[PDB]
Amino acid sequence: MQPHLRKLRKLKRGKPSDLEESVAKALFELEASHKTLRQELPRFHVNTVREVKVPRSKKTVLVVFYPLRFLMLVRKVQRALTSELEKRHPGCLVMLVAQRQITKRPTDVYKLQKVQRSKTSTAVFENILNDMIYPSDVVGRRWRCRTDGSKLMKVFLDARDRKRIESRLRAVAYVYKQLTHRRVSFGFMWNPKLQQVSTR
Amino acid sequence: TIGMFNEEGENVDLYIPRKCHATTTLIEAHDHAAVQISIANVGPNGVINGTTTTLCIAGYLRSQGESDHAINHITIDRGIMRIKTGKP
Amino acid sequence: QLAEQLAAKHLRDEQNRNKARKQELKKREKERERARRDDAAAAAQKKKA
Amino acid sequence: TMMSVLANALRTIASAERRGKRQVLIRPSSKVVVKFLQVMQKHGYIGEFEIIDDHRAGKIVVNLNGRLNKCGAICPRFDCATTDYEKWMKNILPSRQFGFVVLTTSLGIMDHEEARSRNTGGKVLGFFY
Amino acid sequence: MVRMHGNGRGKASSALPYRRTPPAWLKIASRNVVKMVCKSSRKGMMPSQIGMELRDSMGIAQVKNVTGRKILRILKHNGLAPEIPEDLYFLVKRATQMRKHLERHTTDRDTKYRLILVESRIHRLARYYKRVKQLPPTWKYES
RNA sequence: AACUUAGUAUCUUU
RNA sequence: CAUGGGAUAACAAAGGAGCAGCCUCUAGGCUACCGUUUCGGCUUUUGUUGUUUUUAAAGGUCUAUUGGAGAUUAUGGAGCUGUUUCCCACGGUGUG
RNA sequence: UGCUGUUGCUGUUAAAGGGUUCGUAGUUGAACUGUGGGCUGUGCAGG
Ligand SMILES: NC[C@@H]1O[C@H](O[C@H]2[C@@H](O)[C@H](O[C@@H]3[C@@H](O)[C@H](N)C[C@H](N)[C@H]3O[C@H]3O[C@H](CO)[C@@H](O)[C@H](O)[C@H]3N)O[C@@H]2CO)[C@H](N)[C@@H](O)[C@@H]1O
Numbered sequence: 062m063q064p065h066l067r068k069l070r071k072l073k074r075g076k077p078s079d080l081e082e083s084v085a086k087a088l089f090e091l092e093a094s095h096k097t098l099r100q101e102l103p104r105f106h107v108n109t110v111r112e113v114k115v116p117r118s119k120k121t122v123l124v125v126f127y128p129l130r131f132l133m134l135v136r137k138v139q140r141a142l143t144s145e146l147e148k149r150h151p152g153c154l155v156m157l158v159a160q161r162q163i164t165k166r167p168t169d170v171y172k173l174q175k176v177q178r179s180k181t182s183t184a185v186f187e188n189i190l191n192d193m194i195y196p197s198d199v200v201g202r203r204w205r206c207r208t209d210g211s212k213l214m215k216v217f218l219d220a221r222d223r224k225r226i227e228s229r230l231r232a233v234a235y236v237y238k239q240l241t242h243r244r245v246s247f248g249f250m251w252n253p254k255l256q257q258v259s260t261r
Numbered sequence: 262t263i264g265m266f267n268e269e270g271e272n273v274d275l276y277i278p279r280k281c282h283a284t285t286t287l288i289e290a291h292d293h294a295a296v297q298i299s300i301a302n303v304g305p306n307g308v309i310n311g312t313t314t315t316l317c318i319a320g321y322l323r324s325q326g327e328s329d330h331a332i333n334h335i336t337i338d339r340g341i342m343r344i345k346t347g348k349p
Numbered sequence: 350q351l352a353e354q355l356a357a358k359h360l361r362d363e364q365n366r367n368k369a370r371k372q373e374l375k376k377r378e379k380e381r382e383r384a385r386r387d388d389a390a391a392a393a394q395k396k397k398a
Numbered sequence: 399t400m401m402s403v404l405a406n407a408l409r410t411i412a413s414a415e416r417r418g419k420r421q422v423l424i425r426p427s428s429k430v431v432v433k434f435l436q437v438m439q440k441h442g443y444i445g446e447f448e449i450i451d452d453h454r455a456g457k458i459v460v461n462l463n464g465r466l467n468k469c470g471a472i473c474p475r476f477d478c479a480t481t482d483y484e485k486w487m488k489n490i491l492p493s494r495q496f497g498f499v500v501l502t503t504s505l506g507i508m509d510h511e512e513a514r515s516r517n518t519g520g521k522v523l524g525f526f527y
Numbered sequence: 528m529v530r531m532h533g534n535g536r537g538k539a540s541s542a543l544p545y546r547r548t549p550p551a552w553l554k555i556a557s558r559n560v561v562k563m564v565c566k567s568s569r570k571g572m573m574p575s576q577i578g579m580e581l582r583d584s585m586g587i588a589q590v591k592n593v594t595g596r597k598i599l600r601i602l603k604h605n606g607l608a609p610e611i612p613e614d615l616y617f618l619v620k621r622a623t624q625m626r627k628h629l630e631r632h633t634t635d636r637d638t639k640y641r642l643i644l645v646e647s648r649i650h651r652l653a654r655y656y657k658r659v660k661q662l663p664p665t666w667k668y669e670s
Numbered sequence: 671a672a673c674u675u676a677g678u679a680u681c682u683u684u
Numbered sequence: 685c686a687u688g689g690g691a692u693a694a695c696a697a698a699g700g701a702g703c704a705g706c707c708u709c710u711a712g713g714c715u716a717c718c719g720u721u722u723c724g725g726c727u728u729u730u731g732u733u734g735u736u737u738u739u740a741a742a743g744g745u746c747u748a749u750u751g752g753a754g755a756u757u758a759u760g761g762a763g764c765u766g767u768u769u770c771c772c773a774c775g776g777u778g779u780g
Numbered sequence: 781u782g783c784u785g786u787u788g789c790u791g792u793u794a795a796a797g798g799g800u801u802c803g804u805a806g807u808u809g810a811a812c813u814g815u816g817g818g819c820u821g822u823g824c825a826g827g
């Protein structure tokens with residue numbers, strides 16, 4: 062088969078989709094002729110590629126699911142790899158997300174005690190959000206419970222990263238709602254140590 | 262529409278006491294320290310036209326010395342006092 | 350007697366894990382060689398074109 | 399040491415309401431405390447409240463209106479059948495026309511009126527009016 | 528220390544940061560951090576001292592934040608964990624030193640009072656460690 | 671409409 | 685005593701290298717299985733019951749061998765030797 | 781008769797905190813695994 066098809070799982074090599082094929086060629090082309098990615102890509106492959114429209118905006122989001130065992134590999138070169146993939150795919154935002162299993166919360170206390178804590182929905186959803194914003198880290202988290210009974214989560218980021226993530230925040234919130242079916246709102250703190258929220 | 266109402270829809274309350282505009286506390290008939298303050302509205306010119314805004318402050322707040330702070334908060338809320346000076 | 354039973358189970362476990370590690374190393378090398386064949390045939394196509 | 403987080407939270411709110419504050423900070427937080435606040439909020443006795451995450455037992459900031467007179471936990475939990483509701487309203491509520499006894503039931507945390515409507519008993523958590 | 532045995536109400540303690548990510552300027556690999564932890568342990572240093580030296584001279588604020596494992600966990604995985612838990616070891620050492628002083632100073636009743644508190648602390652600590660099976664059953668501190 | 675940050679020295683001193 | 689509900693709690697366990705264990709397609713080669721201080725039991729069709737045996741199947745060790753995963757990079761680690769995209773109105777950010 | 785107080789007592793001065801500390805039974809004991817979306821209609825929902 063095509064040499065660039067080993068950047069996908071062997072399941073999808075037979076009949077790759079258009080987006081999976083395009084990502085595979087870009088990863089294979091980046092496997093060479095790139096200093097930082099040549100050291101890590103050869104051991105790396107992706108699971109699937111999914112497109113999200115992100116309404117009230119242009120520049121749809123390409124979500125690239127990869128196996129969780131490559132988390133450290135992706136983390137080391139996430140910034141460079143995201144930029145190169147976005148360069149190869151104009152009019153798109155690239156989101157590298159690790160495929161994670163979720164263990165349904167048992168109704169039995171003895172089964173609850175044996176649940177792996179990284180398989181819980183809360184841990185998985187936080188890690189998915191951390192994947193989404195990776196260069197920036199969560200500096201604070203709050204839940205506003207309105208008088209109507211709704212509870213909305215606000216995630217604060219460091220204001221020093223505003224020029225690198227503010228444009229993508231709307232895309233991040235929608236794709237997070239797609240993957241996790243939970244809502245997240247974003248804010249910026251110029252002094253996270255003192256809980257100082259940036260006004261503008 | 263305020264107060265105790267009958268099954269026949271008749272208000273059975275003797276009267277409806279005032280509520281403090283700072284703490285939403287009922288002002289009792291024996292307070293004698295609760296005050297009512299009227300602030301005149303001002304038109305485009307510096308002249309009061311015909312109208313006032315009324316504030317009710319419970320007597321306990323005045324005894325604690327927090328009536329001035331409460332009146333500051335209420336007037337800022339109602340748009341009477343400016344919370345800060347303008348930009349230079 | 351409990352000591353021999355416990356030791357035997359531990360020995361079986363170490364043998365099982367060692368066998369699995371060898372098998373995974375075998376599949377890794379076979380796939381790596383196959384990847385070499387794919388790249389070599391890619392070079393052959395480049396020579397044609 | 400602190401034995402009941404819920405009792406600490408409810409007492410903090412009651413003291414702040416008694417002192418006439420507009421905001422009150424709660425520490426530490428818990429799921430039971432949040433559910434108690436939501437029942438209070440659904441009936442209009444408190445305004446907005448915010449849960450602050452500290453990677454520990456979190457904190458809560460509660461916006462207080464002037465409607466809450468008193469809230470308090472009931473210790474021990476004192477399990478309550480469907481026939482014991484009128485007994486508890488008589489004992490710890492100012493009137494049969496307002497105020498709520500909050501219980502924990504297998505259907506969730508809810509006030510006594512909703513618990514009677516769903517025909518379920520439980521364990522008394524607290525009260526507010 | 529503070530509250531148990533002596534009605535002290537001190538609050539001094541560390542305040543761990545909210546953001547757990549290692550700083551970007553820390554270029555050291557996790558496998559090397561594990562190596563230093565084991566190397567420091569082989570020199571006889573206790574886990575508390577190992578963390579402080581890494582914090583003071585290597586810019587490693589939290590071993591767990593860098594490697595995902597606590598220092599004692601790393602020592603246990605490498606077979607370098609102390610035979611007796613660190614806090615129990617230090618309490619036993621203090622009790623032995625106090626008893627050595629009391630052998631000559633028989634009228635130091637304040638030290639005798641402090642010794643009672645230390646030995647009581649040892650026995651409560653031993654009860655916990657035997658329950659969680661970090662101490663062999665029939666472990667007993669002998670005066 | 672509940673602010674994005676709101677100084678200051680004196681005396682002795684192999 | 686029976687049964688529905690699982691929020692609040694209780695009992696028990698565990699103290700996390702003190703740890704389970706990746707499945708799957710095809711070939712094959714050996715080995716019957718259990719009893720065992722004891723010389724003993726041991727499926728079905730062979731018309732039936734006893735006796736002696738086979739072809740086997742079904743497990744088990746091994747040689748492989750196909751295709752899929754993996755919750756943590758083996759194209760790795762350590763030891764060893766040598767030398768354009770995006771935002772904005774053109775500017776800014778990111779990766780080269 | 782809330783003068784036996786589980787509901788529901790009192791203990792600075794009226795009756796009543798043990799001189800201090802350790803401490804076994806006993807009583808009590810922090811947080812967390814979490815409560816879903818979509819569509820239609822409807823309701824001063826609201827900014
Ligand atoms: N220090 C060694 C320990 O001895 C233990 O064995 C000891 C215990 O089984 C038992 O000791 C008991 C003890 O159970 C019980 N809780 C208290 C009792 N005082 C002890 O008894 C012992 O001590 C007293 C005087 O101190 C002696 O008169 C007596 O002869 C002795 N058996 O008798 C043995 C003493 O020789 C265990 N082997 C183990 O805990 C450990 O090896």
Ligand SMILES: [K+]
Pocket residue numbers: 804
């Ligand atoms: K005890």
Ligand SMILES: [Mg+2]
Pocket residue numbers: 530531532533534535
């Ligand atoms: Mg003490």
Ligand SMILES: [Mg+2]
Pocket residue numbers: 703
């Ligand atoms: Mg083991």
Ligand SMILES: [Mg+2]
Pocket residue numbers: 781
């Ligand atoms: Mg009586």
Ligand SMILES: [Mg+2]
Pocket residue numbers: none
């Ligand atoms: Mg009576």
Ligand SMILES: [Mg+2]
Pocket residue numbers: 783789790
């Ligand atoms: Mg009396």
Ligand SMILES: [Mg+2]
Pocket residue numbers: none
């Ligand atoms: Mg007296």
Ligand SMILES: [Mg+2]
Pocket residue numbers: none
């Ligand atoms: Mg608890």
